[PDB]
Amino acid sequence: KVYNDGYDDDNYDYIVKNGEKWMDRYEIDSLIGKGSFGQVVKAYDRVEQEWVAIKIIKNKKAFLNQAQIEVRLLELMNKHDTEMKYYIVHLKRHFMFRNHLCLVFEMLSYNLYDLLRNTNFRGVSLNLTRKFAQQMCTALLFLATPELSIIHCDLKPENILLCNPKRSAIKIVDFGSSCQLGQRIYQYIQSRFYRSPEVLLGMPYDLAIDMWSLGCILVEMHTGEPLFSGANEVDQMNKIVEVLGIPPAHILDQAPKARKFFEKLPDGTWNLKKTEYKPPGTRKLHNILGVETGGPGGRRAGESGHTVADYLKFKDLILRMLDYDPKTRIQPYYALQHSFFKK
Ligand SMILES: C#Cc1cc(/C=C2\SC(=S)NC2=O)ccc1OC
Question: Where is this region: Disordered?
């Protein structure tokens, strides 16, 4: 059995060969990414005389249609004049090659997960996470443009990449799972660790879910570990409840999946269901961040920009991004006016 005249494997993925030359232009070096969508290769563009990342979408109608949505979103974002658009991965061009849709992006550096791994999961300076926080807040403000109204829908350290390994400039990549504001067509969305309470409770979701994701990411970038590392959605909700407490009754009364996690007592109030965790809201973020104990594991004791005053500004902003209420959860514009960013 051969697939696509021997160009494709059995999983519809194009068989990447180091040194192969496409259309007398792109020279493939190596595979730099993989997923259900297909693969990503480092290639040299002979025309522009620069390195590019080519996202080879696997030869399947389902995966091609998903990529077409991604291309439309990227091209729509590219059209906007604002210089906030330079916090989003730039799609240079897209073409069909041997029955594969190929998205040519600008070549970037390491993602923030590789960064966390370089630290052995002890996290980066509060000064660096502030630089990341402000760029991310600007990127989410850009996606918040009414004409775009884009929900990234899969924000995580892996999907945030450095432009340059010796600069702190970041770009959000992978809009392959993205939607624009609209009917709640999907419900199992976002990576588990960065999944908003809305999605967990199966309630309608807006652009605020990306802000929840950001809150979870920035704490992780400082401490080194995911704030909420759930083995399942029930474990996920319980780990959120440990830090933030029981979500307000007004939210859970409207929540279709409320009773997956909580039981409604005869007095109208909500408790957890038992099956292991701290009492609700007793794993204070004050302690996780180490506000008064020299930061995470006391590893930032005596470091410049790691004062109690600096940590309190950070904690205030993170608690505003992790507001259970998506309608009062802090929006990108207001997050950018926060004292955490005031020099
Ligand atoms: C490694 C890498 C890598 C990935 C991208 C972009 C992607 S990957 C994806 S899936 N969706 C995108 O938009 C862009 C540049 C890169 O070079 C480090």
Answer: 275-304
Mutate-to-test residue for ligand 1 from 161, 163, 175, highest number of ligand atoms within 8 A of CB: 161
Residue 47: Cβ-neighbour burial (10 angstroms; 0-12, 13-18, 19+): exposed
Token look-up 């494709």 returns 8
DSSP string, 16-69: --TT-EETTTEEEEEEEEEETTEEEEEEEETTTTEEEEEEEE-S-HHHHHHHHH
Method of structure determination: X-ray
**What is the position in ligand 1's atom list of the atom closest to the CA of 105?**
14
Q: Whose CA is nearest to atom 1 of ligand 1?
A: 32
Residue 91 in contact with ligand 1 by CB distance below 6 A: no
Catalytic member of 5, 24, 81, 154 = 154
Give the DSSP H/E element, type plus range, for residue 164: none
Look up residue 110 and give its two tokens: 């390491």
Q: Which domains are assigned to the chain?
A: 21-82+89-106 (3.30.200.20), 112-335 (1.10.510.10)
Distance in angstroms (rounded) separating the CA atoms of residues 226 and 121: 10
Is-contact 281 256, C-beta < 8 A? no
The CA R_g of the chain, rounded to the nearest whole Å, is 22
d(CA 33, ligand 1 centre) in Å = 7
Structure-block tokens of residue 241: 């409840």
